[PDB]
């Protein structure tokens, strides 16, 4: 039994090994702790929106959506229908992005490394979609606490449809490379098994639950924007191992394509931010012709909107699991407290239990199957 | 509604068992993956010939900042300091005073481009479209100091990029 | 794509699917990068009459939380936080992958 220190996302890992078997595993985190939550308390709500792009930086608009939902719940307003449809469409696009990243980097760490390129081509196309809508490839800051910042340009839906009608074959090629390969099976099958009771007790959420057979999904049980309206299936595993989570994530990509099709077809007309110029800023023409609109633009961009006092916990089914925010407002234009609940924290906490009696080379596979991004883990 | 991903039962008749044994012994799925990679070799690569070819962008793209001016030649900025009040990263520093003709104009306008997070809040807070975040993204630098822009640098940026900045604003302003 | 017939047949055989039907590279089927101007309709509150803000003020309708069982001041059937969750249906599109 010897102690190894695998130092420098960036992760430090201290493990006690007896032979090849892992006897103890202890992750040391905080190498990416910037202090987002304390810095948020010095910014207004609009000023604090961009931090959530950086929190889980593979699924940006999902974090934006969770923050916006919390702020809207505290504001007692609701976004217009078209804003909700745009939010759900770009949330499913973001889910596709996150799942591609997770699966292909899992394979890369295992050693496959070809689907990484195959699917980062598609990831670049989706970044182009993000850029067209907001002017930024990844940190869009598009979804605001009153709706969305800007409307879609006149050719965006056509390009989204054109992209999304070929993506199924890309998933099929990924499956041809990975699903039935015996080396992939022997790397993933019966590795990192977690029971349903241990998954529930340890605070796991997302695929980590469904890989063990637990039937839970916040998009189905507690829908938030327009999720109840759209129909999709929730993939459920049977063994609680890495292979089942792989299969769940691929099927989630397919169901995300299904929801994207539905969202493309059922886009409604109308405005994109709540018609309340004390929360959402007025248009530039109104601001340059109306006195009330100019006053409201001035005050919203200098001071911000005051949020009624109260504390809320808002959660969404982000690609990596339940992403939540505990937001405490004192009645002013700056949040009093903003605690962020990231599923990566709980999953990395459970890594020690999940890597019991496995080889040193399986810790890599377990970390990959947890889908750990250390921006959300450390904050 | 829910689906099962791994709830399949292998058939135990002799033909299925022989198929599984032949797959184990002759490596059929391995050859099929080889075929997938081989087919993928014979299709056109997605690489572009940078710097002779460029990645597509949008009129909404955020890039190097600029200070615009009216057609007459007078700068648009009036030192209202809304861009400085809204900046999430506190990258803007502004100082103003009455000009020699009583005009409300800045005497200091600094952007620390190593603090900026390129969110575009500054250009959407400005009521006179003075500060914009223009199309340029190739402005990498050999020293830390050249990334601390002052008023002269931003005005030169505006006068340098005005044609394309105005064209992009014309293309996009009806969405704002 | 400018791929010869022999190379196309070879790649479709090696892959096992029809590749020209779903290509990875974007061609003239995409939308133009220069578009007509939009009109962008206005919201529901752009009325001229019957539009007082005191009737559409969401923030001012928020209330402090209702205090129940302040310790500072019947059959009684047992109750649960919410009715028990219904079982999910087995996806009559592909119940089994």
């Amino acid at each position: 039994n010897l102690t190894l220190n695998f130092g420098p996302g960036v992760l430090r890992l201290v493990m006690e090994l007896s032979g090849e078997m892992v006897r103890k595993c202890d992750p040391h985190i905080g190498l990416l702790h910037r202090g987002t939550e304390k810095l948020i308390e010095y910014k207004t709500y609009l000023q604090a929106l961009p931090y959530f792009d950086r929190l889980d930086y593979v699924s940006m608009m999902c974090n934006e959506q969770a923050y916006s939902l919390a702020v809207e719940k505290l504001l007692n307003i609701q976004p217009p229908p078209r804003a909700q449809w745009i939010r759900v469409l770009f949330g499913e696009i973001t889910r596709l992005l996150n799942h591609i990243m997770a699966v292909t980097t899992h394979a890369l760490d295992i050693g496959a490394m070809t689907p990484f390129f195959w699917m980062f081509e598609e990831r670049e196309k989706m970044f182009e979609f993000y850029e067209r809508v907001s002017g930024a490839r990844m940190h869009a800051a598009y979804i605001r606490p009153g709706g969305v910042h800007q409307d879609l340009p006149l050719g965006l839906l056509d390009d989204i449809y054109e992209f999304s009608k070929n993506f199924s074959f890309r998933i099929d090629e990924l499956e041809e490379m990975l699903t039935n390969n015996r080396i992939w099976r022997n790397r993933t099958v019966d590795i990192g098994v977690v029971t349903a009771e241990d998954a529930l007790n340890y605070g796991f959420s997302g695929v980590m639950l469904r890989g063990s057979g637990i039937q839970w999904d916040l998009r189905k049980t507690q829908p938030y924007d327009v999720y109840d309206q759209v129909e999709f299936d929730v993939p459920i595993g049977s063994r609680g191992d890495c292979y089942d989570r792989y299969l769940c994530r691929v099927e989630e990509m397919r169901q995300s394509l299904r929801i994207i099709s539905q969202c493309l077809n059922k886009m409604p007309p109308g405005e994109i931010k709540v018609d309340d110029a004390k929360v959402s800023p007025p248009k530039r023409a109104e601001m340059k012709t109306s006195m009330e609109s100019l006053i409201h633009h001035f005050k919203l961009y200098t001071e911000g909107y005051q949020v009624p006092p109260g504390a809320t916990y808002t959660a969404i089914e982000a690609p990596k699991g339940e992403f939540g925010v505990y937001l405490v407002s004192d009645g002013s234009s700056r949040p009093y407290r903003c605690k962020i609940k990231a599923p990566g924290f709980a999953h990395l906490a459970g890594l020690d239990k999940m890597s019991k009696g496995h080889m040193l080379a399986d810790v890599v596979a377990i970390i990959g199957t947890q889908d750990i991004v250390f921006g959300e883990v450390d904050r | 509604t829910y689906k099962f991903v791994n709830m399949r039962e292998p058939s135990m008749d002799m033909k299925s068992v022989t198929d599984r044994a032949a797959q184990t012994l002759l490596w059929t799925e391995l050859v099929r993956g080889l075929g997938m990679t081989l087919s993928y070799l014979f299709r056109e690569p997605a690489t572009i010939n940078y710097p002779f070819e460029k990645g597509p962008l949008s009129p909404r793209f955020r890039g190097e900042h600029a200070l615009r001016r009216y057609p007459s030649g007078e700068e648009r900025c009036i030192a209202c300091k809304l861009c400085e009040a809204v900046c999430p990263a506190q990258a803007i520093t502004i100082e103003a005073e009455p000009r020699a003709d009583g005009s409300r104009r800045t005497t200091r306008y600094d952007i620390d481009m190593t603090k900026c997070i390129y969110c575009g809040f500054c250009q959407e807070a400005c009521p006179v479209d003075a500060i914009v975040e223009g199309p340029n993204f190739e402005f990498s630098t050999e020293t830390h100091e050249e990334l601390l822009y002052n008023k002269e640098k931003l005005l030169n940026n505006g006068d340098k990029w005005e044609a394309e900045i105005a064209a992009n604003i014309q293309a996009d302003y009806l969405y704002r | 794509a400018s791929a010869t017939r022999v190379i196309q047949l070879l790649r479709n055989w090696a892959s096992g699917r029809d590749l020209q039907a779903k290509l990875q590279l974007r061609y003239q089927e995409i939308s133009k990068r220069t578009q007509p101007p939009p009109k962008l309709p206005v919201g529901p509150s752009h009325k001229l009459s019957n539009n007082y803000y005191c009737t559409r003020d969401g923030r001012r309708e928020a209330m402090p939380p209702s205090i129940v069982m302040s310790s500072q001041k019947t059959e009684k059937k047992a109750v649960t936080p919410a009715p028990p969750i219904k079982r999910w249906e087995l996806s009559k599109d592909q119940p089994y992958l």
């Binding site: 199924s168 299904r258 077809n265 007309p269 | - | 939009p38």
Partner: peptide, 29 residues
């Protein structure tokens, strides 16, 4: 004068999108 013009799906919607898993069996006993 002019009417509303924004990004909307075309009349009749878009064509169907394939999402089902498609891994054909090459075929040999």
């Amino acid at each position: 004068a002019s009417k509303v013009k924004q990004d909307m799906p075309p009349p009749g919607g878009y064509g169907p999108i394939d999402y089902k898993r498609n891994l054909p069996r090459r075929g040999l006993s």
